[PDB]
Amino acid sequence: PPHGELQYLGQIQHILRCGVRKDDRTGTGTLSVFGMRARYSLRDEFPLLTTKRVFWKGVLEELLWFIKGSTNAKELSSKGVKIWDANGSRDFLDSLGFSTREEGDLGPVYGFQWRHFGAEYRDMESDYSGQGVDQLQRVIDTIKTNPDDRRIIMCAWNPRDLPLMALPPCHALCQFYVVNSELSCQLYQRSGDMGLGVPFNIASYALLTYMIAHITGLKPGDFIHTLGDAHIYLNHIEPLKIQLQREPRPFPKLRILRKVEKIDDFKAEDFQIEGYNPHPTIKMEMAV
Amino acid sequence: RPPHGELQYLGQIQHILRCGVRKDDRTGTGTLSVFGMRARYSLRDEFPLLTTKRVFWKGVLEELLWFIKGSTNAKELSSKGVKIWDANGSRDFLDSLGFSTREEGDLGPVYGFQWRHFGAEYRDMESDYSGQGVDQLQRVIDTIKTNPDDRRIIMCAWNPRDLPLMALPPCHALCQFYVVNSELSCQLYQRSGDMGLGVPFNIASYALLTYMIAHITGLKPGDFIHTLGDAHIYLNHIEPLKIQLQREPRPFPKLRILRKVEKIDDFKAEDFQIEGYNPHPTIKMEMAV
Ligand SMILES: Nc1nc2c(c(=O)[nH]1)N(C=O)[C@@H](CNc1ccc(C(=O)N[C@@H](CCC(=O)O)C(=O)O)cc1)CN2
Ligand SMILES: Nc1nc2c(c(=O)[nH]1)N(C=O)[C@@H](CNc1ccc(C(=O)N[C@@H](CCC(=O)O)C(=O)O)cc1)CN2
Ligand SMILES: [Cl-]
Ligand SMILES: [Cl-]
Ligand SMILES: [Cl-]
């Protein structure tokens, strides 16, 4: 087979050549296309992109915090991972009109929705225990008890909650599906920062599928990535033109280091990325 | 060449017949299934109503107008001559899900409810929901009118809080609009596709919805992109589909809107005309209740 990384590089090239120029909320400007699809195998490989060093600590800390149910950027920041920080700052918060919120309180984003869909948000500090729908645990429970079920969904798109989010979910909705003894996942990504977010988001969902496969006794299958609004910010064009000239090296493997029973017990130290040989880091700026 | 138009649907069928996995399902029918497919249907001077069989267009049109009104009552649809929801609202079905105290035809907070009242507290199918919840459809329209650059133009029917009250959770789960070159496109995330019966309706339906929104926003329809999660043929569809896969698609019909409409709720059935529709004969297929 060809390297799966070529799909992503394919997507980049496609946007650079035929994407429309639009204005955007962030002021940066973008090139954008609508409606793309890639399929990354998870069978004895893991799609951490190799044409640039991806911040793997970032992906892994990020997801654990999602699982944790946290909406507090500083709880992520404590770990070495400054990715959510700008969306959670005094400045940004004030520019959305959220003058009462504390520094780092992103609103009812991913963690809250994955774990407590439907609950009344208050602040990142509240104890939301027992409240809302625990979509994640229900996914796991469905995979174990009725793997043939056609409703195995986790949705972060909460239209009621939209007005309180520092930012509405880019990765809006996933579906898992079991065939033979393999667990697959399809992500519907309504909005894809192709330069910065998407490398993270791909690894993020591949890693989630690995975790759920581990605790359900399934083997991981495919991660299918459906994009809606896929954009390159203009300050990413030159950076990605550098990236486009690199040859993918073989994807690494993800190793899980102990039998873990419940999604909540996973710790950063339970994972090891083996045989990851990326090209150098390419600094790209985050559009705020 | 890679397939285009109806050929995508036909090839989707062939792939499930030759490739899908045999599973038992909630209906007891059995299915063949496959996970994660995609098709792109042009809406430019063509309307994707399948020609390899006669699709019940009035069904499609009457089902979408019912969605838009925000009805959750099978009988309001049934009374228009369109029976496709009756089985999912019958006494027996409702009871089998434990809804004994609920009136026949009360589907719960399904599609129409979520589009125009997302997050409101569902009472019964009879309640006035005038001005409660999030009106997603109206929000779609207005953001298209005023900020086409917005990468958050989304109508989502998937409501985890409301699932336990639904006759059936949404098969067409979420949709997103996109605007380029004064053209309106729409991607649909269909978590569950009944490939022989519902999927022909769904395509026609999203394409319909896109024509109406294009029409009220001063845009021209572009593309309908169809993303399938779980895609499945019911076993007792297999022989009927074998007739269908024998036939050559004919060119798609055109859809004409008959008058200048300003508001979404203003559309009536009389406003649409399908022109040059030329299907091979209806192929009947039993529904999986
Ligand atoms: N513009 C934008 N904002 C967003 C997202 C996004 O994808 N794009 N997100 C949705 O995903 C969240 C943030 N995700 C992010 C993922 C990676 C990086 C980033 O700066 N990547 C660098 C830095 C790595 C490091 O910190 O050492 C890199 O990989 O080069 C930033 C945000 C919320 N806000
Ligand atoms: N099994 C099943 N249940 C479902 C759906 C579905 O697609 N399949 N739906 C999600 O979409 C909803 C109803 N949609 C339907 C659309 C068409 C037909 C059907 O029987 N089609 C016949 C109609 C013929 C006629 O009425 O004249 C046909 O097209 O031959 C049934 C349900 C609710 N539950
Ligand atoms: Cl609650
Ligand atoms: Cl480096
Ligand atoms: Cl012919």
Q: What do you see in this structure?
A:
Two copies of one chain form a homodimer. Helix content of chain A is 30%, strand content 22%. In chain A, strand 4 (171-179) and strand 5 form a beta hairpin. In chain A, helix 2 packs across helix 6. With 288 residues, chain A is α+β, with helices and mostly antiparallel strands. The first copy, chain A, contains nine helices and eight strands. In chain A, the strands form two sheets. Chain A has a six-stranded mixed beta sheet. A two-stranded antiparallel ribbon of chain A has the order 7-8. Chain A has one domain (1-288): Thymidylate synthase/dCMP hydroxymethylase domain (Thymidylate Synthase, Chain A, 2-Layer Sandwich), CATH 3.30.572.10. The A-B interface holds A 20, 22-25, 32, 34-35, 37, 39, 117-118, 132-133, 135, 148-151, 153, 155, 157, 159-160, 162, 168, 172-173, 175, 177, 179-180, 184, 186, 188, 190-191, 222, 224, 226, 228-229, 231 and B 21, 23-26, 33, 35-36, 38, 40, 118-119, 133-134, 136, 139, 149-152, 154, 156, 158, 160-161, 163, 169, 173-174, 176, 178, 180-181, 185, 187, 189, 191-192, 223, 225, 227, 229-230, 232. One chloride ion binds at residues 119, 131-132 of chain A. Chain A: It is found in: Nucleus; Cytoplasm; Mitochondrion; Mitochondrion matrix. Chain A: Its EC number is 2.1.1.45. Chain A: InterPro entries: Thymidate_synth/dCMP_Mease, Thymidate_synth/dCMP_Mease_dom, Thymidate_synth/dCMP_Mease_sf, Thymidylate_synthase, Thymidylate_synthase_AS.
